[PDB]
Specification:
The complex is a heterodimer of chains A (about 160) and B (about 170). Chain A is mainly beta and about 160 residues long. In chain A, about 10% of the residues lie in helices and about 30% in strands. Chain A is built from two helices and eight strands. The termini of chain A are close together. Chain B is built from five helices and six strands, in the order βαββαβαβαβα. The longest helix of chain B is centred in the middle third of the chain and has 18 residues. Classes of the chains: A mainly beta (about 160), B alpha/beta (about 170). The structure holds ligand A1AHB, phosphoaminophosphonic acid-guanylate ester (GNP) and magnesium ion. Chain A: This is Peptidyl-prolyl cis-trans isomerase A. Chain A: It catalyses: [protein]-peptidylproline (omega=180) = [protein]-peptidylproline (omega=0). Chain A: Keywords: Acetylation, Apoptosis, Cytoplasm, Glycoprotein, Host-virus interaction, Isomerase, Isopeptide bond, Nucleus, Phosphoprotein, Rotamase, Secreted, Ubl conjugation.
């Protein structure tokens, strides 16, 4: 299982580094998408993109690096790819899971849970977990709101594989 | 002072609730899929020669959260019930949205307008007369709209204001 990192910034000021284990043993295709988008090695990826939806009590969502508004993103396999499996569950804070527009519409958008979100089980593919820096993700909730609109610009200033 | 009207837009996912609302508020058409959590907007308009303030709640059509509509159905004064004319399922969902609004309001008499959206598209599956008949049996107006071309957008929201006004008085 590979490890990737995000260096998070708030209006351009560093907030700190979050690292993720990617569950390549259970969801190899989904993990490889996120790994490659974190390094940028396909010529595009997460670096510079923002967390566009943060809802305190539930999750931080980001990964739209093509439109930067919550409607875009693409995978390394194409704009969309299929749900690989739903083996893993949204068991608590720190779960890393794919956002989607319904069945088999995974792209690059993802979310990090800040609570157990059991009703998402079987509908979003869980593929990783925060390894270090969960308190940084908790700190990103300070800039969210009830409908997810953020009060400051929360960006991935740098990202890569460890 | 200016009268404020609390409008709520409801309907199945992807029928165009936000596209209609953003056409009214911002006069442009969102081509992208941006599924709503919950959004609120303000706009002043002149209707029948008087200025009033529209407070518009754009709601989620996401089918997973159907048990969390009660709070906004309690506070809303009138309801834009939207289906898409190329989606028969969204038309069938209308009855369920209306019943839910009546149940939360505990009233069979709630200001409402039935809205058949996406009338710019050729792939029509819901017949105009079928929606006209359904609206007639509800006792509410029916308007065909397109958020893409702006057809009927002003008329739908203005007609709901007129309905709410008749209910307040
Ligand atoms: C009723 C109000 N509401 C609520 C909600 C639910 C509760 N509960 C309390 C009791 N418990 C037991 C059940 C839930 C409480 N409070 C609220 C909110 C704060 O009240 C305003 C949610 C929600 C989600 C959508 C629409 C309305 C919604 C929605 C609309 S599109 C969607 N989800 C899925 C979303 N697709 C996308 O972005 C697509 C565009 C990209 C490609 C997506 O992949 N992800 C990732 C997973 C999380 C999801 N986003 C999201 O943001 O979830 C928000 C959350 C708050 C977690 C759930
Ligand atoms: N051709 C056409 N497309 C439309 C029209 N209204 C909306 N759409 C398109 O249909 C899709 C869904 O629109 P949207 O307004 O987001 O629907 P919604 O009812 O708000 N969805 P949700 O309940 O998830 O928030 C988008 O691709 C949008 O551009 C219309 O009148 N004509
Ligand atoms: Mg919407």
């Amino acid at each position: 299982n590979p490890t990737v990192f995000f260096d998070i910034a708030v209006d351009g000021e560093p907030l700190g580094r979050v690292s993720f284990e990617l569950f390549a043993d259970k969801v190899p295709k989904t993990a490889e998408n996120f790994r490659a988008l974190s390094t940028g090695e396909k010529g595009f990826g997460y670096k510079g993109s923002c967390f566009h939806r943060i809802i305190p009590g539930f999750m931080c969502q980001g990964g739209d690096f093509t439109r930067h508004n919550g409607t875009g993103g693409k995978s390394i396999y194409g704009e969309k790819f299929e749900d690989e499996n739903f083996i893993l569950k949204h068991t608590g804070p720190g779960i890393l899971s794919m956002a989607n527009a319904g069945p088999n519409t995974n792209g690059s958008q993802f979310f990090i849970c800040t609570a157990k979100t059991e009703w998402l089980d079987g509908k979003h593919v869980v593929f990783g977990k925060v390894k270090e820096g969960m308190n940084i993700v908790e700190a990103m909730e300070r800039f969210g709101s009830r409908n997810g609109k953020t009060s400051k610009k929360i960006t991935i200033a740098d990202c890569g594989q460890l | 002072s200016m009268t404020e009207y609390k409008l709520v837009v409801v309907g199945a996912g992807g029928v165009g609730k936000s596209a209609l609302t953003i056409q009214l508020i911002q006069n442009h058409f969102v081509d992208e899929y941006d599924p709503t959590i919950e959004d609120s907007y303000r706009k002043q308009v002149v209707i029948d020669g008087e200025t009033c303030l529209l407070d518009i709640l754009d709601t989620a059509g996401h089918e997973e959260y159907s048990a969390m509509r009660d709070q906004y159905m309690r506070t809303g004064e009138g309801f834009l019930c939207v289906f898409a004319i190329n989606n028969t399922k969204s038309f069938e969902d209308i009855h369920h949205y209306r019943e839910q609004i009546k149940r939360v309001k505990d009233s069979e008499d709630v200001p409402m307008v039935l809205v058949g959206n996406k009338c710019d598209l050729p792939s029509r599956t819901v017949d105009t007369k079928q929606a006209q008949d359904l609206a007639r049996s509800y006792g509410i107006p029916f308007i065909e709209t397109s958020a893409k071309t702006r057809q009927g957008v002003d008329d739908a929201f203005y007609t709901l204001v007129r309905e709410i006004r008749k209910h307040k008085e």
